[PDB]
């Protein structure tokens, strides 16, 4: 169901920067190879989870990329969110393409 193998067009790449108490978490799908952004083929959303070591995954953010050509407006599948996270663990990003399903990426915090 969820594809874990890396894919330049579909894999949601996670970058982590610690700014004081906040984690600055960048998620981008198609960073190096641009994914199409068309009404019938686009990256629709990304979910961000934090799974602290020894605990359940906690939903951190849900980002919907809503524009795909309406009046020539396009939302690129890239977002920056901010969270206070306690302890060590791994971030989990899940993204959805309207034709090619779901893709997952994990990155150690």
Chosen from its own copies, Fe ion, none, partner binding at 8 (C-beta under 5 to 8 Å by type): none
First to last CA, the chain: 25
Task: Kindly state whether residue 100 participates in binding Fe ion, applying the rule CB under 5 A.
Answer: yes
**Are the beta carbons of 14 and 93 closer than 8 angstroms?**
yes
Tell me how many residues contact Fe ion (CB under 5 A).
3
Q: Could you tell me how far CA 56 lies from the centroid of its own chain?
A: 19
Say whether residue 98 binds its own copies (CB under 8 A): yes
8 part of the interface to its own copies, by CB under 8 A: no
Structure token pair of residue 84: 């206070």
Calpha distance 102→93 (Å, rounded): 10
Q: Does residue number 73 form part of the binding site for its own copies (CB under 8 A)?
A: yes
- Contact residues toward its own copies (CB under 8 A) are 1-2, 22, 39-40, 44, 49-52, 55-67, 69-76, 78-87, 92, 96, 98-102
């Amino acid at each position: 169901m969820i594809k874990t193998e890396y894919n330049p067009k579909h894999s949601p790449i996670i970058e982590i920067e610690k700014e004081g108490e906040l984690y600055k978490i960048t998620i981008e799908v198609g960073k190096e190879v641009k994914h199409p952004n068309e009404p019938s083929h686009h990256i629709q959303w990304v979910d961000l989870y934090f799974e602290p070591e020894g605990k359940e995954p906690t939903h951190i953010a849900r980002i919907e990329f809503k524009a795909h050509g309406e009046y020539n407006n396009y939302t690129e599948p890239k977002a920056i969110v901010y969270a206070k996270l306690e302890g060590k663990g791994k971030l989990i990003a899940i993204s959805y393409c309207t034709l090619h399903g779901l893709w997952k990426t994990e990155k150690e915090l």
